[PDB]
Amino acid sequence: LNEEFRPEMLQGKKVIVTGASKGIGREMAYHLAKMGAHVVVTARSKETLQKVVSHCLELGAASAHYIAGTMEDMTFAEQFVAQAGKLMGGLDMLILNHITNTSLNLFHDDIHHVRKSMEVNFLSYVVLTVAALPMLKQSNGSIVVVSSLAGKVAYPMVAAYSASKFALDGFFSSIRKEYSVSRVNVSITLCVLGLIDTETAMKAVQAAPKEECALEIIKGGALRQEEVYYDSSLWTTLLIRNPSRKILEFLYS
Amino acid sequence: QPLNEEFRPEMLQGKKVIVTGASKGIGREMAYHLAKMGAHVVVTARSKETLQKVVSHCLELGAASAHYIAGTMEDMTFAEQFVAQAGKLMGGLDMLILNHITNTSLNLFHDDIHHVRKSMEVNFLSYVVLTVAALPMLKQSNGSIVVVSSLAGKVAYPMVAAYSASKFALDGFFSSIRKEYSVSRVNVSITLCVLGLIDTETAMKAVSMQAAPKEECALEIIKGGALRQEEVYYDSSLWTTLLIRNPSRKILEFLYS
Amino acid sequence: QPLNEEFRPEMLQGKKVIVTGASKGIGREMAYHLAKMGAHVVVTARSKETLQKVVSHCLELGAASAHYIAGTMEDMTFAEQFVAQAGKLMGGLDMLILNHITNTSLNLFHDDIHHVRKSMEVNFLSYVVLTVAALPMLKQSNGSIVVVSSLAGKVAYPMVAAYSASKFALDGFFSSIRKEYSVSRVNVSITLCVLGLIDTETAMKAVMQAAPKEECALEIIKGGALRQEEVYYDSSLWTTLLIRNPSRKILEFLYSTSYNMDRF
Amino acid sequence: QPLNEEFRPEMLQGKKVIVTGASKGIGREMAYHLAKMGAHVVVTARSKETLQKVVSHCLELGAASAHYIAGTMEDMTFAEQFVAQAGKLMGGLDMLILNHITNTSLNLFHDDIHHVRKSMEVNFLSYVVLTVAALPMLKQSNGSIVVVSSLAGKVAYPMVAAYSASKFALDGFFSSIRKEYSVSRVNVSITLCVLGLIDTETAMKAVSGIVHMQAAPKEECALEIIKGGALRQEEVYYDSSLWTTLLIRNPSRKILEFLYSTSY
Numbered sequence A: 001l002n003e004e005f006r007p008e009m010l011q012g013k014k015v016i017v018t019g020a021s022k023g024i025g026r027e028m029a030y031h032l033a034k035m036g037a038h039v040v041v042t043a044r045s046k047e048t049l050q051k052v053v054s055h056c057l058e059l060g061a062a063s064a065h066y067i068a069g070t071m072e073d074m075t076f077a078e079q080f081v082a083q084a085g086k087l088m089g090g091l092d093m094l095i096l097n098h099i100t101n102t103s104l105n106l107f108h109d110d111i112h113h114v115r116k117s118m119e120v121n122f123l124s125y126v127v128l129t130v131a132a133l134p135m136l137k138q139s140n141g142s143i144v145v146v147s148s149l150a151g152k153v154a155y156p157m158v159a160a161y162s163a164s165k166f167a168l169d170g171f172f173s174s175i176r177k178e179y180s181v182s183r184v185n186v187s188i189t190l191c192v193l194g195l196i197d198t199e200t201a202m203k204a205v206q207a208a209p210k211e212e213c214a215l216e217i218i219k220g221g222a223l224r225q226e227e228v229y230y231d232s233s234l235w236t237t238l239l240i241r242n243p244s245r246k247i248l249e250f251l252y253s
Numbered sequence B: 001q002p003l004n005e006e007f008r009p010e011m012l013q014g015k016k017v018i019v020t021g022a023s024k025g026i027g028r029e030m031a032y033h034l035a036k037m038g039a040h041v042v043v044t045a046r047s048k049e050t051l052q053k054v055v056s057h058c059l060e061l062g063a064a065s066a067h068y069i070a071g072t073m074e075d076m077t078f079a080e081q082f083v084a085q086a087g088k089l090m091g092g093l094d095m096l097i098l099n100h101i102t103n104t105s106l107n108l109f110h111d112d113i114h115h116v117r118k119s120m121e122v123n124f125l126s127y128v129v130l131t132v133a134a135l136p137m138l139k140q141s142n143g144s145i146v147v148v149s150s151l152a153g154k155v156a157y158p159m160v161a162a163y164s165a166s167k168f169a170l171d172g173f174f175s176s177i178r179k180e181y182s183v184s185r186v187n188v189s190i191t192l193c194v195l196g197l198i199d200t201e202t203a204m205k206a207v208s209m210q211a212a213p214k215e216e217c218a219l220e221i222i223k224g225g226a227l228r229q230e231e232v233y234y235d236s237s238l239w240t241t242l243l244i245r246n247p248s249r250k251i252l253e254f255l256y257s
Numbered sequence C: 001q002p003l004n005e006e007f008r009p010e011m012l013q014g015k016k017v018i019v020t021g022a023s024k025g026i027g028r029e030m031a032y033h034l035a036k037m038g039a040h041v042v043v044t045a046r047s048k049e050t051l052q053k054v055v056s057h058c059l060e061l062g063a064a065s066a067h068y069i070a071g072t073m074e075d076m077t078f079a080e081q082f083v084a085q086a087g088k089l090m091g092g093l094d095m096l097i098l099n100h101i102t103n104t105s106l107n108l109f110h111d112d113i114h115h116v117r118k119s120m121e122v123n124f125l126s127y128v129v130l131t132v133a134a135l136p137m138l139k140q141s142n143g144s145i146v147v148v149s150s151l152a153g154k155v156a157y158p159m160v161a162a163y164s165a166s167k168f169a170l171d172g173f174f175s176s177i178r179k180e181y182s183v184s185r186v187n188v189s190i191t192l193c194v195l196g197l198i199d200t201e202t203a204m205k206a207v208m209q210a211a212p213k214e215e216c217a218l219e220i221i222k223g224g225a226l227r228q229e230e231v232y233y234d235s236s237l238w239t240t241l242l243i244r245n246p247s248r249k250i251l252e253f254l255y256s257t258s259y260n261m262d263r264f
Numbered sequence D: 001q002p003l004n005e006e007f008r009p010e011m012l013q014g015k016k017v018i019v020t021g022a023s024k025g026i027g028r029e030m031a032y033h034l035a036k037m038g039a040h041v042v043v044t045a046r047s048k049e050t051l052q053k054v055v056s057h058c059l060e061l062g063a064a065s066a067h068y069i070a071g072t073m074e075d076m077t078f079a080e081q082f083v084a085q086a087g088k089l090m091g092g093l094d095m096l097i098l099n100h101i102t103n104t105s106l107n108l109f110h111d112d113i114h115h116v117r118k119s120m121e122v123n124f125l126s127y128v129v130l131t132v133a134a135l136p137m138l139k140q141s142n143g144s145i146v147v148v149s150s151l152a153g154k155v156a157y158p159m160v161a162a163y164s165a166s167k168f169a170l171d172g173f174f175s176s177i178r179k180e181y182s183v184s185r186v187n188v189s190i191t192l193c194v195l196g197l198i199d200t201e202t203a204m205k206a207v208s209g210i211v212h213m214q215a216a217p218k219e220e221c222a223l224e225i226i227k228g229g230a231l232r233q234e235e236v237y238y239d240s241s242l243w244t245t246l247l248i249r250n251p252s253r254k255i256l257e258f259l260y261s262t263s264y
């Protein structure tokens, strides 16, 4: 779009946010709440989710519902979309944000962490996406994929994490192109985040604030942007872009 | 850093070397080369018939030793054991050349989670099991790991999303450890190879542009692996190859580090 | 700070404008496009004969006005006096287009230092002199300066050392002041035009896949019209994509903070 | 193509090296280093008094030989005689270090066309004259030309427009002669040095209170330059900030030159 962002773009939209119990996903739920969308939030914490929702109503959500689950269950994820699109009567925006817990750790031989990472952080995203597609095609809707610097560049202590984040990129970019000719009109937004000041991130480890981070993710999705960047450093963000890649893609088109 | 000297076919003398996806296409030609350098190879794949026909031609091209195992890298259990049996069969390891990948066709993605899944299993996880399983031998031998990849593992392209994802995943993975090794003084070479269109039998079947030949490619893979190079590009197009590098990134990494 | 909406031929109507080396090639074309949009126009070059034709034909196409002043930009006194006189004739200036260059052939460089100096004098120095003479009137109309350059003014190419040197100089000097005008809040914009091969009798008589001079010109004009920092034009979308330098914009705007200009 | 293999100080022992603007800053430091390595040296600049101190220290320090010849590079005759004289004093030449610049100061540009002419004369054209005069010797020793430039000679920057024009000017000129040497098969390396703020007296004098970036150490600066020369590299990047030094090279350019290279 040629636009500038304004809060009202979300008013009355039917939004899904995953990994919505804490951290950025919640912040996003709240932002959407403030902007009066319909929101369905998911994560494992039944009792925390209910509270996020109540808060969403007080903020002025078109409506807010929760479905508790774990994205390790591919079945749960197919059915979550089904159910969620029932509570809202459709879907404008799918925000894929959840991750499985990991640690800063040297990879010796922790294979089961790699596999899990790949299922939670990447496969569930494909599944949610697949289930969310006919309705997003309905609303000429949007898919938002939360990633990180570590999905663009190498870092140590997070091989499993990066593998999966790098994977989102490969798969959704390629999918983006696909839609960019089947003239399927769903946007796909890949968010690349630097350190954000989330409880989990801070207790695991300069940090950018989560509140503004969430909104920047929502802005990028509403503006149908291809990629969103966000980091405590401006130095950081300018650089994350990759010109050499754009040319190559267009060259090979 | 890529051990500073121009290539030499001798580097591959008595070097104990596995090649996966070594039954046909590029995988085969990588083996052949290694043989004509007097290295001990162990090739794997499925078709044991065609794999027999591969070990043979190896020896009579001067391979120190050439054995084979036949299995499916869908089988993580299998792969883990293939690396032991192989290390027992050669009494060591200097080069691990992961190169196999499941079968895919050119297609719009739309519904096939099965495929996305199979691909992440055989293209990516398998490679991570072999590696883990090869780590002790490689640690003693101060050797090399080579991961084959593609243009589609660096840039976006339609019709092959399952694929690109698996390949994008390797980079993210192996570059991540590469650096872990660096801050562990761990002495293992990690080499990722970016290959544009290569003329292989199976690859050419379902593309019906510019085809770079299998020969120089496998050669190229090895050079890089021995040469201890971080990555190795190779497309039929010089024009592309130097921007298909990614200076943008080399910075930030080295920057944050 | 480029524009906030796209280009209409009417933006030049009754705009006062100078075109240099407008006695042929891209220059002559810029002039025609301009008359054809009803701008006032002063064109210059050494040859009075040919300039006469440019001027007449220019009236034929709807030029608010059209006149010339013949001279060599080898002469800074001319350069200086030429702008005043053209400024007087029109009652102002909205856009300056620096486009002339000295004659040049393809040769390996050996010892001809005279050619290097003249290249710098005519291609680069004069442009500066003209800018100096024109800025007061340009400040007045918030107009634009357009500097016509070449790929060989961003990348290295044999057979054109002197030529290339001067074009490099142009980018160097004018990019610097552009940023300079930025923070002294001068509202004159500067557009630098990076051109591949264009099919001008001279270019062609000299030298590969020429883009048409006719279009080049309009774009040049459009570029300056739309107050863009750079215009690229070449008969190869491919090249025009390889032309930009992201790194450079990056560190320009990184180091964009290492200074305060208040002693001024 | 830089010499595949790594630098050793002895690469310079016995080598006949001219260094210009070698009475202060980087230039002095270059003389010194070369002195340590046992090189023959001929420095030059305007103030002979200070040039004498340098010549002393180089001799004490171990030069195989060391002179100065004083003079202003405003005078092309001199620049040209110099080389002849320096060649005379060493029986040939292996490396030419082009380094001097005219005194200049952080200022907005206004109407100082002279400053702009002097800069092109001193920081650019003299380099060319000196080079022309050396080529014939350098040819004989398969020697090297070393040109000292700035980041202001790769990216725009305000307050240094005349300076910047002339440094840009060097890039376009020496980068095009560089190619020319490849094709004509001339074997003299040409090394362009792209520096950030170096901690020289003058420099520090000049940017203090107006600019606040990190100055790199002039001693190390000096040696990077010689190795770059000795290794026959095309560019030497040197800044305190290893960020900077990394995104400074332009690969689009290397590409574009390559395209239009082997495909004329």
Ligand SMILES: NC(=O)c1ccc[n+]([C@@H]2O[C@H](COP(=O)([O-])OP(=O)(O)OC[C@H]3O[C@@H](n4cnc5c(N)ncnc54)[C@H](OP(=O)(O)O)[C@@H]3O)[C@@H](O)[C@H]2O)c1
Pocket: A018, A019, A020, A021, A022, A023, A024, A025, A042, A043, A044, A045, A048, A069, A070, A071, A072, A097, A098, A099, A100, A101, A120, A146, A147, A148, A149, A193, A194, A195, A196, A197, A198, A199, A200, A201
């Ligand atoms: N924080 C940063 O510095 C940073 C940097 C770059 C990228 N990111 C991206 O930001 C996103 C979340 O960031 P964050 O830092 O805010 O993380 P976070 O606060 O810890 O929250 C992750 C969310 O996922 C839910 N979750 C965890 N395991 C799950 C599972 N198995 N199934 C379903 N839901 C699960 C968690 O809730 P439950 O435990 O209740 O299930 C939580 O709501 C991630 O995609 C991450 O990659 C963050």
Ligand SMILES: NC(=O)c1ccc[n+]([C@@H]2O[C@H](COP(=O)([O-])OP(=O)(O)OC[C@H]3O[C@@H](n4cnc5c(N)ncnc54)[C@H](OP(=O)(O)O)[C@@H]3O)[C@@H](O)[C@H]2O)c1
Pocket: B020, B021, B022, B023, B024, B025, B026, B027, B044, B045, B046, B047, B071, B072, B073, B074, B099, B100, B101, B102, B103, B122, B148, B149, B150, B151, B195, B196, B197, B198, B199, B200, B201, B202, B203, B204
């Ligand atoms: N060809 C190209 O243009 C191209 C381009 C970019 C990247 N690459 C990379 O080049 C590498 C080799 O590609 P290629 O074109 O040479 O492929 P190929 O000729 O079709 O060979 C695939 C190999 O993998 C083996 N394989 C197939 N399924 C397997 C399984 N389930 N478990 C274990 N091994 C299996 C095959 O042997 P069996 O079927 O008998 O088991 C065969 O040896 C691939 O990693 C690809 O990523 C190729």
Ligand SMILES: NC(=O)c1ccc[n+]([C@@H]2O[C@H](COP(=O)([O-])OP(=O)(O)OC[C@H]3O[C@@H](n4cnc5c(N)ncnc54)[C@H](OP(=O)(O)O)[C@@H]3O)[C@@H](O)[C@H]2O)c1
Pocket: C020, C021, C022, C023, C024, C025, C026, C027, C044, C045, C046, C047, C071, C072, C073, C074, C098, C099, C100, C101, C102, C103, C122, C148, C149, C150, C151, C195, C196, C197, C198, C199, C200, C201, C202, C203
């Ligand atoms: N055409 C290309 O392939 C190409 C490529 C890249 C950049 N460009 C740029 O585009 C611009 C125009 O090029 P062009 O091809 O149109 O050139 P052109 O047709 O030969 O025009 C040169 C103009 O400058 C004038 N001129 C020559 N010497 C002069 C002097 N000493 N003092 C004042 N004016 C003088 C000429 O008229 P008189 O001789 O009668 O005075 C003529 O009008 C130049 O800046 C060039 O660098 C062109």
Ligand SMILES: NC(=O)c1ccc[n+]([C@@H]2O[C@H](COP(=O)([O-])OP(=O)(O)OC[C@H]3O[C@@H](n4cnc5c(N)ncnc54)[C@H](OP(=O)(O)O)[C@@H]3O)[C@@H](O)[C@H]2O)c1
Pocket: D020, D021, D022, D023, D024, D025, D026, D027, D044, D045, D046, D047, D071, D072, D073, D074, D098, D099, D100, D101, D102, D103, D122, D148, D149, D150, D151, D195, D196, D197, D198, D199, D200, D201, D202, D203
């Ligand atoms: N230092 C930095 O922050 C920095 C940054 C980027 C690039 N550079 C480049 O590094 C090189 C050396 O810089 P620097 O900082 O060392 O400067 P500097 O200390 O001021 O060196 C100037 C030298 O040039 C000589 N010189 C001045 N005018 C001359 C003239 N008209 N004719 C002949 N020689 C003349 C000076 O001696 P006399 O006056 O007695 O002749 C002195 O030897 C320059 O090319 C500069 O562009 C420096």
Ligand SMILES: CC(C)n1c(-c2ccc(OC(F)(F)F)cc2)nnc1C1(c2ccc(F)cc2)CC1
Pocket: A102, A103, A104, A105, A148, A149, A150, A153, A154, A155, A157, A158, A161, A193, A194, A195, A196, A200, A201, A204, B252, B253, B256
């Ligand atoms: C390490 C952390 C800051 N990070 C990042 C991240 C990775 C690399 C970064 O810098 C660079 F890319 F340059 F390495 C910056 C942020 N992405 N997700 C994360 C999080 C994380 C990842 C893994 C982990 F074990 C603990 C936390 C989610 C916080």
Ligand SMILES: CC(C)n1c(-c2ccc(OC(F)(F)F)cc2)nnc1C1(c2ccc(F)cc2)CC1
Pocket: A248, A249, A252, B104, B105, B106, B107, B150, B151, B152, B155, B156, B157, B159, B160, B163, B195, B196, B197, B203, B206, B207
């Ligand atoms: C599609 C093909 C050319 N390709 C590629 C590839 C190379 C360059 C490409 O261009 C671009 F750079 F844009 F990605 C795209 C894909 N990488 N592996 C492949 C192969 C392939 C992958 C998937 C498939 F279904 C059929 C073939 C392995 C031959």
Ligand SMILES: CC(C)n1c(-c2ccc(OC(F)(F)F)cc2)nnc1C1(c2ccc(F)cc2)CC1
Pocket: C104, C105, C106, C107, C150, C151, C152, C153, C155, C156, C157, C159, C160, C163, C195, C196, C197, C202, C203, C206, C207, D256, D257, D260
């Ligand atoms: C040499 C010619 C092609 N050229 C160019 C030019 C443009 C792009 C070029 O390619 C590359 F990008 F590689 F520099 C090379 C030269 N710019 N002005 C010119 C002209 C020219 C300059 C010098 C000369 F001797 C003869 C003609 C002005 C016509």
Ligand SMILES: CC(C)n1c(-c2ccc(OC(F)(F)F)cc2)nnc1C1(c2ccc(F)cc2)CC1
Pocket: C251, C252, C255, D104, D105, D106, D107, D150, D151, D152, D155, D156, D157, D159, D160, D163, D195, D196, D197, D202, D203, D206, D207, D211
């Ligand atoms: C301005 C200064 C830092 N500088 C530079 C320079 C280096 C990096 C710069 O940063 C960037 F280019 F990125 F803006 C800018 C200018 N190059 N030569 C210089 C010097 C200089 C040039 C001109 C002047 F007026 C005063 C000092 C020789 C010291």
